[PDB]
Structure formats: C-alpha cells, structure tokens
C-alpha cells in the first residue's frame, strides 16, 4: 500500500542491503574477446529539444580482468550516468557492468575468441521500491481523473525492481567436470595461436563473505566500541589441461591463407622475414644503481608491442608444467577410459 | 527499510535462532581424510606503519571425529578470528570449523585417503541483518554524496545475511543404498591397508533434538 | 524479534495451530510389525544425584 498525501522534504536516502543474480558461466577462446556496454553519447544540437534527456550509445568494449559483469540494472556506465551516486551500489557506481554479444561473437569469421561456452542462470524478484526527486517528464493529464483532499498532487512513478536470484544449490553445479570437446562449433577447431589462451568464469555459488571481529580492549562486560570490525573475501581456483600437438607443412596455399589471416603467427616463425634476423642482439649490463645513466624506462624499444599490454590480466605460466606421462593425474586416467585406451 | 539514524550505545544484543546449511555426504579411504580450515598468521615485519588489520592463513589438517563442519561463514576459527563470540551460536562460537580438502586428496598420487565420496547440498538466504561495532574501515567519499542534519551521520555497512536450507524429500535420500565398487578414482582399488578404514558422513535431516 | 528484557507472567499459554509432514508409504507383512518408542529408563544405582 501507499497512502496519500505527499510528505517529502529535502532528501530521504536510507540504508539497505540487497543481493543479486545467480549465475555460472565460462568461455574458451585463443583471441581475446570483447564485451559491450552502454554509455552517454553526442546528440544533435540542431534540434530545439524540449526534452533534456541525453542519448545512450552501446560501446563494444574489450573485457579486462577484474572488470564488472552485468547484474541487471542496465548495462551502462554508472560513473557518468548516476549523478546522485547514491542509488546504485558503491562497488559498481565507479565502474561499468558488461554482457557478452554472443551473436556478434558468432559473427567473427574465424572463431578464435570462442571455442566453447556455457551459461547457467536463474532469478526471481523479491521486493519493489521507488525513487524520488524531480522526475524528468511529467504525466499527461488526459489519461486519468484528478482529485484532492489527500489526492491533490501526483506522486513520482520512478520505480525499480529488486533482484533476488534463486536458491543456491550444488545439485546443478558445472564445475569439477571433464568436457571432452568432440567438435568445436566454428572454424577454429580448438587451435591456439601465438601460444596463448584467455579463459574466464563468473560464479555466485562461491561468493560468501569473510568478516573479522577484533576486540581492541578486553573487558568482561560488553561494550560495542571494543571492536574494529573488518571484512575480507577469499576465492580458490585451479585448472587442468590436456593438449595435442599438430603438424603444419608450410605450403604456398597455406602460407597465403595464414599471413593474410594473421602475419603475427609468422613473425614468431620468421619464414622469409628480414627484420627478425636484425644484427647483433640485445646486450645487457649488470645492474648499477646510481651511474650508468639509463633507467628502467620503456623508451627503449619493445620486443613485443600490442594494446593488450595496455590492459591487465591474470598471467598464468605453463611453459614448465608439461608432462608426457598422463596416467599420474586424475584426468589422464579419465582420458584413457574416454579415449578407450 | 531503514528509517534514519543509527544510535550510539555499547550494549544491544538479543536472542534469535535460525537453521543452517543442509547436506548429505560421505567419503571412504584407507588413510584418514584431510581438511583445510582458516586461521591467523604471523603479522609482518613492521615496515608498514599504516594501520592494524590482522593476518590470516588456511591450515591443512587430517580431521578427526567430533570436529565441526563449516556452514557458510567460511571454514575457520571462531575463537581467534572472532573476538565477541556473539556473531556465532554458542555450540559453534568456541570452535574451529573445517572443510575437507578433497582437492589435495585428488592431487595425492595414489589416492589412499580416498576411495569414493558423495555430496549433495543446497542453500538460500532467509533475511538480512547487520553487525553492531566500530567499522574499522572507512568508505571513500566521492563514490556517493553525503547527507546533512539527521542524515549527516553515515551509518555502518556491516551487513550480514542469515541462511535457510530448502525443503528435503525422501527422493533426495543418499543413504541406505548400495554403491558398488567397479572403478575407483586412484591407484588403490579398494585396498584397505593396515586392515583399517576411515569412514565419514555428515547428515542434516535427522538433526532435531 | 526477541528483545530484552522479559515481560513474563505466572501463566503464558496460548491458542496456536500447526501443520505436519507429508506421509505416503506402503507396508505389508503376514507377521505383525513392531515400532519403537523411547521409554523413561533407569541409569545405574548411584549416580551422585548431581542433576536429575
């Protein structure tokens, strides 16, 4: 219920907690993937806009590590678009939430950012609440009847729903399971390029909170102000991997197909390329602190330059974790039954 | 809702009661089963002169009979990591709850602490409440806009949820059935070494008093 | 809500109602079936009478 008439004063912001979407998701792909989001754009100033609403443009950004997935409040920026900064949670209000464009991820020719994916999600809404303040556009009078007494002035219809997810069960987990890909869905049938792969996961089933109670002064009678209450949050991860080497004879039909596709998986191969010889290679010092006037700067030329270096990821080394004998691992035995060997 | 504002005071506790995480599970292996649990650590060297927030570590241990399972507040100590013992019910406020390390028992070479294991678990929240103490961490200011007068005081954000297991049925029964050895996970195929075995189980549907 | 202090009395009984568990089962036998029920039994003879 919501009775009449209107109460309000200057500002009436309150304290609430809430919770969010239940999900499980994953992606495999050698090329790095993108991810779209919404944001304000440049509008025409040649119109006499009686409305004052700014436009909204989709920005097909490239997903970094530790940036934010969508939660269900618009896939928009929240720094430049929530001027109040006190309506959307603090964790996301100075960030931007994202979603994947699976169909534009389906519209890549080769299919190197997608090798496989899944997603498992459930949600229903518990509560319902609304906003205040000067609402943008008013109501047209000719779709209702008016009144007075308590029914004098109109009330703001600036509502919003509240997500509540679902139950968090283990009976439909997707982790801890082998997935032997029989056939990849696109043209790239699971082959990595440039000796790399980028994988991700977002899960809410493992998202508990780690608080911390620290009494600063011992006493046998209780005071609230003995306690500098802290909070942490922990997460534990691992991966397994089984590969297969493959032989590529560099024929003319292939070498025109691939250099045109990507010259960068030829530059590590340097077949018929004049710069990777060069001359005398890099000549290092031993480290001297004050003298040897050069410094640790990047004005020396980079042996590897890419805008992916401008983004920050979780760098995971596997140049040393290789093994030919596989039965000593709990998936190698799971493979020989799978391969029938 | 929260009608403003939070009030000062040093003593505001009360009795409440709530259920826990439900499960059914077991494990078998001819070595006793292990388990991690989180605790404190050594602080540091005193190079940092910033603040006081305590260290931490998980602790890998073979669990024995009687020890407590974690129910959602992390597998951790309630005496050392907490300090009021009033966030936690009395039976578990003086405990060091663990979670089993099937992971390192999977990366165990032979698999002698594991022959077979089961698990079935589900959960969802009941309500949302908040702690009552000095929040040791402050919140940055430009992330939001502060209010004034009655809304001049910034209330704390030390929220905490409270659990609920789902409905259970007799179709969700794990026990009282045969689970045949035909293929074990590791190198020890059912072989009890030392003519001994280490069996465990945790049930919640027969947990009334 | 169970907030402090008490508002007790020398009498505190009330009219309430509750619902139960959903039973559907089969049982057959040409021999009579038993049940179990906890009976108030005795300990040994002298337990020092600390708590009854």
């Amino acid at each position, epitope marked *: 219920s919501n*009775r*009449y*008439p*209107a*109460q*309000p*004063g200057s500002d*009436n912001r309150e304290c609430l907690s809430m919770d969010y979407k239940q999900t499980q998701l994953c992606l495999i792909g050698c090329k790095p993937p993108t991810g779209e989001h919404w944001g304000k754009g440049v509008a025409c100033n040649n119109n006499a806009a009686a409305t004052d609403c700014p436009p909204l443009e989709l920005f097909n950004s490239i997903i970094e590590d530790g940036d934010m997935v969508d939660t269900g409040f618009g896939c928009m920026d929240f720094g430049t678009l929530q001027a109040n900064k006190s309506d959307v949670p603090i964790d996301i209000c100075n960030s931007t939430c994202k979603y994947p464009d699976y169909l534009k991820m389906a519209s890549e020719p080769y299919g190197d950012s997608l090798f496989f994916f899944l997603r498992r999600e459930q949600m229903f809404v518990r509560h319902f609440f609304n906003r205040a303040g000067k609402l943008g556009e008013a109501v047209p009078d000719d779709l209702y009847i008016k009144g007075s*007494g*308590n029914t004098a002035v109109i009330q703001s219809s600036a509502f919003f729903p509240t997500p509540s997810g679902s139950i968090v069960t283990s009976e439909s987990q997707l982790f801890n399971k082998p997935y032997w890909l029989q056939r990849a869905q696109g043209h790239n049938n699971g082959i990595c390029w440039g000796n790399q792969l980028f994988v991700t996961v977002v899960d809410t089933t493992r998202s508990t909170n780690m608080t911390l109670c620290t009494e600063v002064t011992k006493e046998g009678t209780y005071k609230n102000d003995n306690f500098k209450e802290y909070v942490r949050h922990v997460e534990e991860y691992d991966l397994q991997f089984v590969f297969q080497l493959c032989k590529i004879t560099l024929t003319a039909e292939i070498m025109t197909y691939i250099h045109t596709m990507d010259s960068n998986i030829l530059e590590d191969w340097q077949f018929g390329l004049t710069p990777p010889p060069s001359a005398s290679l890099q000549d290092t010092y031993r480290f001297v602190t004050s003298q040897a006037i050069t410094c640790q700067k990047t004005a020396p030329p980079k042996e590897k330059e890419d805008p992916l270096n401008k983004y920050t990821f979780w760098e995971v080394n596997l140049k040393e974790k290789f093994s030919a004998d596989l039965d000593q691992f709990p998936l190698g035995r799971k493979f020989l039954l799978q391969s029938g060997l | *809702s*929260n*009608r*403003y*504002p*939070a*009030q000062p005071g040093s003593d505001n506790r009360e009795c409440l009661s709530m259920d826990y995480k439900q499960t059914q599970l077991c494990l078998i292996g001819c070595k006793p089963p292990t388990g991690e649990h989180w605790g404190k650590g050594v602080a540091c060297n005193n190079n940092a002169a910033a603040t006081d927030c305590p260290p931490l570590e998980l602790f890998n241990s073979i669990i024995e009979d009687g020890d407590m399972v974690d129910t959602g507040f992390g597998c951790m100590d309630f005496g050392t990591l907490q300090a009021n013992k009033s966030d936690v019910p009395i039976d578990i406020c003086n405990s060091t709850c663990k979670y089993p390390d099937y992971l390192k028992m999977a990366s165990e070479p032979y698999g002698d602490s594991l022959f077979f294991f089961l698990r079935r678990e589900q959960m969802f929240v009941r309500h949302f409440f908040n702690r009552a103490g000095k929040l040791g961490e402050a919140v940055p200011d430009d992330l939001y806009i502060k209010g004034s*007068g*009655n809304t001049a005081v910034i209330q704390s954000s030390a929220f905490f949820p409270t659990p609920s297991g789902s409905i259970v049925t007799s179709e969700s029964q794990l026990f009282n059935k045969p689970y045949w050895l035909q293929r074990a996970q590791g190198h020890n195929n059912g072989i009890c070494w030392g003519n001994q075995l280490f069996v465990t189980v945790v049930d919640t549907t027969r947990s009334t008093n | *809500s169970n*907030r402090y*202090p008490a*508002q007790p009395g020398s009498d505190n009984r009330e009219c309430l109602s509750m619902d139960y568990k959903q039973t559907q089962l089969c049982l057959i036998g040409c021999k009579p079936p038993t049940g179990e029920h906890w009976g108030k039994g005795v300990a040994c003879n002298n337990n020092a009478a600390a708590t009854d």
Partner: antibody, heavy 118, light 108 residues
C-alpha cells in the same frame, strides 16, 4: 480505530524502576513510528523517547541519557519505556505517541500521571 | 541546545478573522518544523509538518512559512474544536526541543 492506551504510570520509589506500556488498539505496529513525550508544568512538552516504524532508530534527550531504555512490541501493539533510578523531576504526566510521517506525531492517548513521590 | 520560544503565547479571537502565530530559532534549523495541539481526553493533531506540507485529513485554511531563523504561520476561518494549546517543535537535531506554547481562546 486507532487509539494508544497508556498503562504503567504511577507511584515509584526514588532510585527505583517501573514498567510503562502503551498498548495500541488497532493498526499495523510495524508500519509507523512510535514515541514517548511528557508534559511538565510551567515547561514545554518534553520529548522522552522516539522509535521508528520497525524499531531501528531510538533516541533520548540529555535529561534521561543512560537512565532510560525504550522498547516496543509489534504483535501486542505496545510501546514501552524501561527507566531506572527515578528522581522527583520525573513526576509529570506522560504521553505515548504514534508517528505517522517524516518523524512527526499525530497521536497521544489520555495518558497517566507518572509521579515519583513518597 | 536549540532553544526556540513561542510568541505570542495567548490568542483571544473571534472566528472568520485572520490570526497569526510565530516561532523564531536559535540556530539555522531550516525548513523542518511541525505544529501540534493538545485537547484533553483526545489525541494530539499534526496540522502541518516541515513548515509547509500537509498531513492526511488536514484542510487548507492553515498556512505556514519561513526559512533560516524566521517563520510565520497564519490561520483564518476557525472552527469550534480549535480551543487548545499549540506548539512548535524543532527536529532538525536531537534533542527535540519545543516552543513555549500558545493557547487559543475564543472571544465573547
């Protein structure tokens, strides 16, 4: 029918305690704020205690700090005031209040004389 | 504390005319101000909260205004249930102090 019926105010030893109870007849007690305020003679109406719609926000003035503790019951529709170690200044006529608004009061009962004397 | 006082403390009036009441402030306790009345045996009534904004069931003959430290409230077209004592009360900060009180009397 919205009516806040006062109960529990009268004579009490100096340095003693007493239990007040402001039973409401009918509404939903969890929706609206509730409060305590007294009237002392030759002085203003003295706000003793306030509480919010559910019970989150309770406050007392400088006169009764540390000595007075406010409570409420939402099911028996009753607002409370547990005070300790009363003095002769607490002799007055006391109202309990219903808050129907932005901490604004639209009700009190007929009240009872809460007099700390001999 | 906030020490607000209510003046003039007494009103003798005949109805239909226009009657003014005031309350001045010690601090800048800007426009958060309600107004009450005490009839014995019945309940207190909130006429206007926040100085200018109206409660359920409250009619339009009341009028109150002011900001900063100055306030003005004015009433015409009276009705015979009005004879009571009226208060102003700050709630901009705790403790919630009151005005001195104004009793309205009818002239005969």
């Amino acid at each position: 029918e919205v009516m806040l019926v006062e109960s529990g105010g009268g004579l009490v030893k100096p340095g003693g305690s007493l239990k007040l109870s402001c039973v409401a007849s009918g509404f939903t007690f969890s929706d609206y704020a509730m409060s305590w305020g007294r009237q002392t003679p030759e002085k203003r109406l003295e706000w003793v205690a306030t509480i919010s719609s559910g019970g989150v926000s309770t406050y007392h003035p400088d006169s009764v700090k540390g000595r007075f503790t406010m409570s409420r019951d939402n099911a028996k529709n009753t607002l409370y005031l547990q005070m300790s170690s009363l003095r002769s200044e607490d002799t007055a006529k006391y109202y309990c209040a219903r808050g129907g608004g932005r901490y604004a009061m639209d009700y009190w009962g007929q009240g009872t004389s809460v007099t700390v004397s001999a | 504390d906030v020490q607000i006082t209510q003046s003039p403390s007494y009103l003798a009036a005949s109805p239909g005319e226009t009657i003014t009441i005031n309350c001045r402030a010690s601090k800048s306790i800007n426009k958060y101000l309600a107004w009450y009345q005490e009839k014995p045996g019945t309940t207190n009534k909130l006429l206007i909260y926040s100085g200018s904004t109206l409660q359920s069931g409250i009619p339009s003959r009341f009028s109150g205004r002011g900001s900063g430290t100055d306030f003005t409230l004015t009433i015409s077209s009276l009705e015979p249930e009005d004879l009571a004592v009226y208060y102003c009360q700050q709630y901009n900060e705790y403790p919630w102090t009151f005005g001195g009180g104004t009793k309205l009397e009818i002239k005969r």
